[PDB]
Design a protein around this ligand. Sequence first.
Ligand SMILES: [Cl-]
Ligand SMILES: [Cl-]
Ligand SMILES: [Cl-]
Ligand SMILES: [Cl-]
Ligand SMILES: [Cl-]
Ligand SMILES: [Cl-]
Ligand SMILES: [Cl-]
Ligand SMILES: [Cl-]
Ligand SMILES: [K+]
Ligand SMILES: [K+]
Ligand SMILES: [K+]
Lengths: 201, 123, 204, 219, 216, 213, 196, 196, 199, 199
Amino acid sequence: TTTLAFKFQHGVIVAVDSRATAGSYISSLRMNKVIEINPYLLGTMSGCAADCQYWERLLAKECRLYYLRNGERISVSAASKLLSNMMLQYRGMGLSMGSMICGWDKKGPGLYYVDDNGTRLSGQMFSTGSGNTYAYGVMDSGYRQDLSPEEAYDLGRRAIAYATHRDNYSGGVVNMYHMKEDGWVKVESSDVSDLLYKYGE
Amino acid sequence: SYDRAITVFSPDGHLFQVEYAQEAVKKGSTAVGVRGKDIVVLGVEKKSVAKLQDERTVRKICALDDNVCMAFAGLTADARIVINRARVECQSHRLTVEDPVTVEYITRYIASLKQRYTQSNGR
Amino acid sequence: SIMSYNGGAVMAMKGKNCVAIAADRRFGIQAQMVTTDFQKIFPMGDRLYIGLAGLATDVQTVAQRLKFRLNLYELKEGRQIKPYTLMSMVANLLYEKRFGPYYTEPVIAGLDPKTFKPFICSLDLIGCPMVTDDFVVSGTCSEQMYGMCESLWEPNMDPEHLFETISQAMLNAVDRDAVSGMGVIVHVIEKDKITTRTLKARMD
Amino acid sequence: TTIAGLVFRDGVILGADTRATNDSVVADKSCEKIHFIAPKIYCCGAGVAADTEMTTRMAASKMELHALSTGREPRVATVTRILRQTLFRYQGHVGASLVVGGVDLNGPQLYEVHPHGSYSRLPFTALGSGQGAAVALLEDRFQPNMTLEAAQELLVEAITAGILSDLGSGGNVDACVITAGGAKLQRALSTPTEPVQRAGRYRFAPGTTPVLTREVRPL
Amino acid sequence: TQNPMVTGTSVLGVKFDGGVVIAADMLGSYGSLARFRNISRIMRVNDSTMLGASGDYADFQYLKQVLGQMVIDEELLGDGHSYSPRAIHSWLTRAMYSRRSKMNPLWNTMVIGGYADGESFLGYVDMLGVAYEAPSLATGYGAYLAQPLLREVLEKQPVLSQTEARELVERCMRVLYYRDARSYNRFQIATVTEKGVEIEGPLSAQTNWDIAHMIS
Amino acid sequence: RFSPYAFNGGTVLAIAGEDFSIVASDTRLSEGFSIHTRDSPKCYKLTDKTVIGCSGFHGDCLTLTKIIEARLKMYKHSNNKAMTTGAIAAMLSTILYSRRFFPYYVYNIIGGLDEEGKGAVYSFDPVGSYQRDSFKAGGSASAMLQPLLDNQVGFKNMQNVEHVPLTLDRAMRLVKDVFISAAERDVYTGDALRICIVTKEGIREETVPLRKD
Amino acid sequence: MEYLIGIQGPDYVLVASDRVAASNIVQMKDDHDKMFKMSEKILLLCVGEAGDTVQFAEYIQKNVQLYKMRNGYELSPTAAANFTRRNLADCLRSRTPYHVNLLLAGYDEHEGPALYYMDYLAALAKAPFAAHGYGAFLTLSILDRYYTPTISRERAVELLRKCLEELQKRFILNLPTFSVRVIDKDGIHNLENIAF
Amino acid sequence: MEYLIGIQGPDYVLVASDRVAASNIVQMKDDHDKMFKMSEKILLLCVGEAGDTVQFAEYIQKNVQLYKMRNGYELSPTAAANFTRRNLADCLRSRTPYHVNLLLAGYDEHEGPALYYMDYLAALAKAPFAAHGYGAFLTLSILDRYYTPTISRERAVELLRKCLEELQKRFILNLPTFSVRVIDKDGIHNLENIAF
Amino acid sequence: TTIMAVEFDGGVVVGSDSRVSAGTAVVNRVFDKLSPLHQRIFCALSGSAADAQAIADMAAYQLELHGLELEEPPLVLAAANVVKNISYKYREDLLAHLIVAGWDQREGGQVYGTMGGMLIRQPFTIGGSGSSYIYGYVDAAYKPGMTPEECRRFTTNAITLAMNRDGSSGGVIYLVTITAAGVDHRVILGDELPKFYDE
Amino acid sequence: TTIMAVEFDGGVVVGSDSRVSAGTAVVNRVFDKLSPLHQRIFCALSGSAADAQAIADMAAYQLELHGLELEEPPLVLAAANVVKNISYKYREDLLAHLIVAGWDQREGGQVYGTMGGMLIRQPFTIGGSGSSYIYGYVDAAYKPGMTPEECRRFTTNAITLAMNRDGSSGGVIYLVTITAAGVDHRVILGDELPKFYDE
Ligand SMILES: [Cl-]
Ligand SMILES: [Cl-]
Ligand SMILES: [Cl-]
Ligand SMILES: [Cl-]
Ligand SMILES: [Cl-]
Ligand SMILES: [Cl-]
Ligand SMILES: [Cl-]
Ligand SMILES: [Cl-]
Ligand SMILES: [K+]
Ligand SMILES: [K+]
Ligand SMILES: [K+]
């Protein structure tokens, strides 16, 4: 897997790959690694697929219960914290999930990283997966808070595409999301190999 | 364990045990709260301290969290339990969720605690 | 697995007075890829080729040590090597390391000098020969390559159609293997000519 | 792999299947598991395919050399002993379980030899993954001094039993008949399964495959 | 059971026209040692279904009393309902899987023969919960030795008479005694039919050792 | 010690069309080098709209199918309606995950129709990660069935093919061809091929013989 | 691998912690805070297992805050440190133990400035100066060399400077930024972060 | 853990290596050179086991020098790289194998600029650009991004700059100084060492 | 495997069973474990089949040469020593117990046990997996100075009981009698086999 | 340990040896392994000493209560079942084989084997480490309808031979005879012990 998220002047963007692997064989190449909790909540998946789906969906259920009870919706900080505690309940049991929580709330654009260990962090940039090292490389060089939406989309695509090139367990298509004050918008779902040939010229 | 239904419905459709507890609060000390524009202020009375008693101990205004405080009326022994249960919930809400407790949530918890004691066995 | 370390895929097919041999172009260590233009098919003479899949060192070593023995054969003998003879030469070379083997499964594909006849075979890592009238596969995606070849191969194929079949068999089998890819190189071998082609394969 | 040996009145008969498995996948559907040793001596190989092949060829080569120096028809008893001592030297690391049968001045003989170097002499035997099935048939329907034709049929039945019952056994059944007059090797004696038929034609119009690079060397 | 103590080898089963026949040798082995050479590994569940069992004998005797009680409990009600051969097979599958999932398995391989509603039943039950139906069944080494024989006869002749099934079984017990080191020449034959379950006494397969002179 | 698992082989395949869904499997049940039975289809009817295919450890497959059968009744008594293809797929995910620390060694593929009448295929892993897709193979020979379907159904690695929509006739032949190819190579695949077709009319079963060696 | 350090003076406690949030081979954060505010004058610095640190640190943090609400006054640095010690020691011989190495710094109105060192085994010891992490092996000698119990705040930051410079030169891990805070009579004061 | 990198241009080869000699948790040297001069135009950069690297690198170095003395001319970059590959591959299935990861850079008068990558398993591959160490996982993507086969020397050093800055920001290990050298028509030129 | 050797005045009796087994499966239900080292010397095979056959062949070879150099039939003691020596030189490498029994002019019929690379002479010896179950039998059923036929009964009986108890022992019983006159080789089939308590 | 139980018309004979050993050292050369469950029911102890004694005590306890509730001497079958049940409930936790033999009015003298948690009735049974060496002996030395004295010889003989062969078996032989009349308990000292082939 390869997953990235970063934020800038115009919001938070999220990009993931689409590949699933069992050992050296490819189970799926159409895999969806983004969970749409809400119009303004977003979660990415890395590690064990079943572990990601179940727990992030369980978080989604709790986000829904929160919205019904108080009728105000949930903060990104609170949402990420909830997920962290669930993994904390199941310590030393070999659950494997690396995820990021994206949202817009009163504080503003929100990005968090949550771990199977129970690690929880807030930051401008995060990348999780087997190819996160490659994603970081392109992301760090060519990133500025002073970015335009088109430029941000370029960086998201670029990061994932190059990561998939180098990494065995990352490939398929790039799924990109934009988080705006109103809510998230799904930018594109572009084939990585075609992008790479385009970049080759 | 003691399993007896204490609070039950009456022929007319009344919960006597709840109504007697409402007689206990009516015997309690006078407490008033009023919301302003910039500030909020509580005020408690019927103190009647014997002036031979240290009044620092018998204060009816308690802080539950950094941003939440409360005043009570009725059985002052019962209040201490509810106050301390709310204070524990204040920090539990801070552990489960990053955010501090909203005023409505604490009120909802105290209300749910009082409701549970009207429909539970033995109490 | 030791074979899984570097990966790779080698395939050979048979047709009407012609043979085809193809391999992936990837050189990579477990987690990452290093080279896009790695060689796995090596010419053992005009109209005879060997493809090697497995551990990249042993792929290169066997190819070099076989060339050592091939050139000495072609100098001592006054002739160019027959495909059956090369198969037995690789078999002897690999079996000599019975209890310390080269981690590579070779594939011989070529036309017999003088007698035109097509020949395709694959071998063990310890040198067990396998001769077929259709196709032979070797690599980490053996099962993927077998599934394609069994469905796509036909008895009498012309050079034009054989190339298309062997390519599509390699293209789609590689796209299901995480340790094989970065381009596919195909050699089509005829009496008159040899056609070398790199295909627009997935680069992920 | 299912291999069997049978002794009858006029000589011996050896059988084998044609399936070679790599991992749990089939690599060769048509391999020869009956091996030439002498004009009138053949050996059936089960175990590590490379080991069976090379051990067999080694024996065959030594046997030819022996015959040349001796000037006489080689003895099967000789072949058995050669095999044992070579195999014993390697402490079972050469994975070759073999059924060797031949005709001598001393008559028709059937031996089985194991990778560790043990040998045993008997009228009928079966080795390999499907041995259980083959032994069952022989145990059930073997009489001494069987006519060749009854022997041919029983051996086929014994090996067929292994093909269907065993997962590491498949393909055609090969038989080799050894008589004082001659040795007749019959490849594909019987084929239980024939599926040539395909319902779909997966052909490609030239140009379907995208090519980046083309280079042609004329000869 | 983590480690089985006294074990029984292969149990046979094949269904003929108008019933099913089951065979199992009367041996209880302690490792390689032949400990008890006259113990029954077959039971009669009711009048419709019978059971032969491989593996740990103590676990078989435990399942023998549990199934035995279940038939007793059902006969007490007398409501015109009885356990069908499929119902016993279904219960046994659920029992074995439940014990397996608790990591405390009953070390047994079962063959269940039955006759109900004019139809012959033959069911296999593993110690892990693997269950299916087949025209012929063989456990342990029988699956490698006796099963190939049964399948080859049933391919040429699917329907057999009771006599044909009996002589096929006796032929299989001969092969099992020759080739299994954990077998013995004392066995029983159980048969379900329209009349019910009939278990026959100590039987011995005819052996021939003339190949002992064919080594010179 | 003692192993709670056994490998019994078997491969299951599902393809989705415009108004149809296909679930297909071999009839071979095996253990080690021996065959248990030649008559063991992996396809199973749940509703008139949904069919399940289980492969792997047969002990788990039998127990899991019985759990789903019971859960289907529990749902319809409580909700007064049949459980939809998507709802069964969502339920199977939770049942498989409830055994996260002692999993079912099972490869499930669900094939049926959605609420719009369109074909739906859901692919699972032993633990419960699932998604909807056009076609998926699961089991011992899944690596043999996949690449041919990627090429033909997905039109991958091809230049100027006009992209023809998938028909039932073409999919049926595709299902047969890949299994015939798999039976030639995979030792655990053979005997017979059973194809279950889910349409608006209901479930129809078809049997084509395979290699018996 | 992380780094903590504390230096106690005559009337103050200086504490510093690195700002690196590391995963396998990557630095995920440049500005991660490893300090926890327990009271107006109590700081808890935690280091160890990824998920275990924050969960444990916040649990104690919320209980010290609970004590403040229930009584109207805050726990003393000693009572706070003994409370954290009790909670860790009780989980030591359990199924799930916490592998956390911590450093508690505080100011008491009676006893004065305090600095407490604690193992993952939960052994408590009061020290004039202490350091956690692999960097301690390189810095404790420098602390031994120049420390006097009458050190001024101006010299304390300069002594910290000498220790942090050693981590840049000799220590194999990259720790470029550090959080620096002082606790005294007036409470906790955020001081200029030391960057390299 | 060390770091190597090579970038081949149209008429030149740029190579860089870190200057850290590390033991357990300490940096013993700030200025250790990991480059070996084989010929006037051949450089061998070695990384791996502590004692195995220098012994192996010098053995090949002295044999390439021996070839020069015995023949009057130097080995070609290709012949040199194939020689190092042969020596490592022959020790692979022996009692004592060398765990060395190396990078050979050279300039041929006929073929031109050359850059060779080699495993500890002794697999040889020619690359337009390559990197060794854990830092390669962070830098190979940057190289993939901005590399063109017609890159100028001015841009190559700037591309190296972008890669080395990534190691300062994201990589957990402290690698402050790097040796930078260029091989071309005129030979090996020592370039300003990149310090942070 | 059950092997037995018994000593009488005229010569010796050597007994064996017919089975070799690979785990729970039998690979040969008709195997002669009685191998001749010389004209009047025999050995009984137990342990690893390959190892036992390998030693048997070498012993026969060395003794054949020994005989020619002396131009006399080898002493049984001599025969026993060569087997003991091969077994001892490679105790860790070879897994076999061979019982060597025969006849020579100097000392008559003699029985030797070489298990583990030791040399002992006994009135009678048993070896193999099956021997465990008959230790009691042989101790109670032995009398000094049994006639050739009494000896044959004795070895046959003991082996029969062992065969029925042991899973690794079965098949038919192979018997040889060594006397000054010659070698008598006989086989006992299952139907001929002695009957005792079975259940 | 060698334990034996033999069945005759009037009742039963239960035999034992006297030794318990800890590895190669003997800790008790005089131990009675014959424990009474009831007035007319006895059991023979083998396996873990602690486990065997623990089961023996519980069986005697439950049967004592069983007897009182029925107000009749317990059936031997009943006795055998309780022992089987305890052994089976804890097959992994308890290491013991108990032979239970006795007399009841309904079915006379009976012998039961509970090894491994199974129930079987036999004309006679042997258990313990020593039993291996006498399997052959018992099969050849058994005749139907042996008189009490014949039964005593039989069990004594078998155990004597086992004792001499087995390192874990030794000491004196303890014998009990259960009949309708009562319990006869006798001990055989080394000097009294039967003699066979020793060398
Ligand atoms: Cl997708
Ligand atoms: Cl040879
Ligand atoms: Cl085949
Ligand atoms: Cl269950
Ligand atoms: Cl459930
Ligand atoms: Cl022995
Ligand atoms: Cl007995
Ligand atoms: Cl016992
Ligand atoms: K919501
Ligand atoms: K907070
Ligand atoms: K003896």
